[PDB]
């Protein structure tokens, strides 16, 4: 611990120093603060080179003719795809829609998203006009690194002499085209000296403050630390808006290689800025010699709905509140057919949220697939891949993925009816090889687990995939007609899209469950919620008001940890009248730090709360009124269960899992000795079955893949 180079008195810097974890990060915080304190970090005045008195906004005549013609000198486009996460099959579908042999594709995958990177590598190895960035940054939301990514990729693309591109377009894995490639090329060939950037469209002083442009930030330890105030440089006009844009090669060359006062000082200023790509390119362009080429239109449709998108949901990543646009739904299709202004792309789309709208758009642009094409209403998304290691899972998911595989092996044994040797009996081996989410018609169907096991009849290793689906537990007790439509317990509630991102509702003893209710239209009402643990202990009780306009409600009761393992129940009443109920599972864990749990560990984790009570308030008075007697025998058995390990613990776990999950089917990836097991590639549900909408083949005569 070395003292700083200057006295540090700013409250914001002190807070950051107290919260930072690495000493390298604390040192960089102190250096940045001290250099700014001496006035040596930020520029204070900048030269403006634009001859205009203000903005240009050169309009574009949006007639039907401007898009239908055939150009003699068509532009060639360089697409930069900035992607992260698990949605590789949707990214392949979108890549299919935008591909043409005359364009170029340069793909940056977040350094954290290793699964997606391996899938992207397969694409780049197939096509000569597709490349991946060798460098990979941890492009956190709102981070300064997103501008560093764009600027490095621009320098890279300019040095690739074998790629003669005319325009630069950036896209995410949640973007999609809303016009054909032919119409895009025709439009850009007509306006090839223009730049397309969209401004905020409001009070400019309010934009600066809302964006935090007058505050100093530092990106370190995958976090944006706020370090204090700063002045907007004098002599230039500051503007901003959307960081999705289209820029021509001439302007990208200026941004990259110019050494004049404007470009130099702006690259320094924006190295310490939040959401830098949302104002850097606006500010440079409007003050540069190229200011007369700006079109106040980014040719995008962004589905902003700040009533749902502004929840200050990134506080753990950045020292600021942010907003995000919503995902499109089927009712939004008509918005893509507007011709008030020219637009060629839209965002956001998410296949795990709603795939129907994606299909409607793709078929509308490029037509239906042939009759009999499989998998068009399905979606598969990988959530664990063996090369990433079991330490990238948690003790919870590792425990439950193991249990799901055993549930499949028991189904294989049961499905064969014979009086001789059972050629469908298996012994599990190793850890799961992969796990997929499975959707059909925008409805979650469960998990697909790929795993290895020994067929005991022939004593040979086989690779299988199991499909497990959760049992339906929501029950309406009303006989009479109220507003309640659904009730659910989970974690990682997404306030913008109104769903749990823990799709399987997988829970362990140290998790903090969230209760959600879904309501229909109607007058105000007040209801009672009750949480019941596996041995009929009442953990919490509270009342909630449902306003006439409320659509969803949720609450996370403060329950002391650890939770008693078993099947919990959540009940809703209306003045003591039953309304509805639902159940959820707190699973006992078989692993500790990815190793088999030990007796003292298990006893500590599976014997209920440490303080011997879920809350300070007690609800023993309600047990008789609700007919919830506590059986002294079941309590003692729960204590015996808490001390179990190994085989006894595995039987307890699988018994609970089997009561809340169903092994729907199991298939073999290769040859098998089980006579009743289908080959995975021949099923309709396996991740090995055909999925042509996301498969990439040879380039067609017209230069397309779709």
């Amino acid at each position: 611990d070395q003292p700083p180079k200057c006295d540090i008195s700013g409250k914001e810097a002190i807070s950051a120093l107290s919260r930072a974890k690495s000493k390298h990060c604390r040192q960089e915080i102190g250096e940045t603060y001290c250099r700014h304190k001496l006035g040596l970090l930020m520029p204070e005045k900048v030269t403006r080179f634009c001859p205009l008195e203000g903005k240009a906004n050169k309009n574009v005549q949006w007639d039907e003719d401007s898009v239908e013609y055939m150009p003699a000198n068509p532009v060639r486009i360089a697409f930069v795809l900035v992607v992260h996460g698990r949605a590789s099959r949707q990214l392949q579908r979108m890549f299919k829609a935008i591909y043409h042999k005359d364009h170029f594709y340069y793909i940056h995958v977040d350094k954290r998203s290793n699964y997606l990177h391996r899938q992207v590598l397969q694409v780049s190895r197939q096509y000569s006009n597709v490349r991946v960035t060798p460098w990979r940054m941890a492009t956190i939301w709102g981070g300064a690194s997103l501008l560093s990514t764009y600027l490095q990729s621009m320098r890279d693309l300019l040095e690739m002499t074998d790629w003669p591109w005319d325009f630069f377009i950036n896209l995410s894995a949640a973007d999609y085209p809303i016009r054909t490639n032919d119409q895009l090329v025709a439009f850009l060939s007509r306006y090839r000296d223009m730049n397309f950037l969209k401004s905020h469209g409001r009070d400019n002083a309010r934009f600066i403050r809302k964006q935090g442009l007058d505050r100093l930030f530092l990106e370190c330890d995958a976090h944006m630390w706020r370090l204090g105030d700063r002045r907007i440089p004098e002599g230039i006009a500051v503007d901003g808006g959307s960081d999705w844009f289209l820029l021509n090669r001439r302007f990208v060359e200026y941004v990259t290689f110019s050494t004049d006062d404007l470009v130099t000082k702006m690259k320094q200023f924006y190295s310490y800025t939040l959401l830098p790509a949302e104002s850097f390119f606006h500010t440079v362009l409007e003050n540069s010699p190229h200011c007369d080429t700006m079109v106040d239109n980014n040719l995008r449709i962004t589905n902003w709905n700040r009533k749902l998108g502004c929840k200050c949901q990134y506080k753990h990543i950045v020292d600021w509140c942010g907003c995000s646009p919503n995902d499109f739904k089927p009712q939004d299709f008509h918005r893509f057919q507007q011709t008030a202004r020219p637009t060629f792309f839209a965002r956001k789309f998410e296949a795990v949220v709603n795939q129907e709208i994606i299909g409607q758009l793709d078929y509308y642009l490029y037509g239906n697939y042939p009759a009999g094409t499989p998998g068009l209403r399905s979606y598969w998304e990988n959530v664990y891949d063996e090369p990433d290691g079991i330490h990238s899972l948690s003790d919870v998911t590792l425990t439950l993925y193991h249990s799901f595989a055993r549930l499949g092996l028991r189904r294989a044994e049961t499905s064969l009816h014979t009086d001789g040797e059972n050629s469908c009996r298996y012994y599990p081996m190793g850890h799961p090889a992969s796990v997929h989410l499975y959707f059909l018609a925008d409805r979650f169907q469960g998990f697909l687990i790929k795993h290895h096991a020994t067929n005991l009849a022939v004593s040979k290793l086989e690779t299988l995939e199991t499909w497990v689906m959760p049992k339906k537990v929501f029950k309406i007790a009303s006989p009479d007609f109220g507003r309640l439509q659904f009730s659910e317990v989970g974690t990682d509630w997404d306030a913008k899209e109104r769903l749990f991102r823990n799709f399987g509702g997988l829970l362990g003893p140290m998790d903090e469950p969230v209760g959600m209710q879904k309501w229909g239209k109607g007058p105000n009402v007040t209801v009672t919620v009750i949480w019941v643990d596996p041995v009929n202990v009442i953990a919490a009780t509270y009342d909630i008001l449902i306003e006439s306009t409320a659509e969803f409600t949720h609450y996370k009761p403060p329950l002391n940890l650890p939770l008693r393992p078993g099947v919990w129940t959540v009940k809703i009443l209306h003045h003591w009248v039953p309304v509805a109920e639902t159940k959820f599972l707190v699973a006992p864990l078989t692993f500790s730090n990815r190793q088999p749990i030990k007796p003292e560990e298990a006893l500590k984790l599976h014997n209920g709360p440490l303080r011997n009570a879920y809350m300070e308030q007690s609800f023993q008075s309600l047990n008789p009124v609700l007919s919830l007697p506590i059986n002294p025998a079941q309590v003692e058995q729960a204590r015996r269960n808490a001390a179990s390990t190994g085989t006894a613990l595995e039987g307890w776990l699988d018994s609970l899992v089997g009561g809340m999950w169903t092994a729907m089917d199991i298939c073999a990836t290769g040859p098998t000795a089980c006579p009743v097991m289908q080959t995975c590639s021949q099923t309709a549900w396996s991740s090995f079955s055909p999925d042509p909408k996301s498969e990439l083949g040879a380039v067609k005569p017209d230069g397309r893949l779709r």
Partner: peptide
């Protein structure tokens, strides 16, 4: 709606 993802200090 308008553009710009910044939502203020909080």
């Amino acid at each position: 709606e308008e553009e710009g993802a910044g939502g203020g200090q909080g």
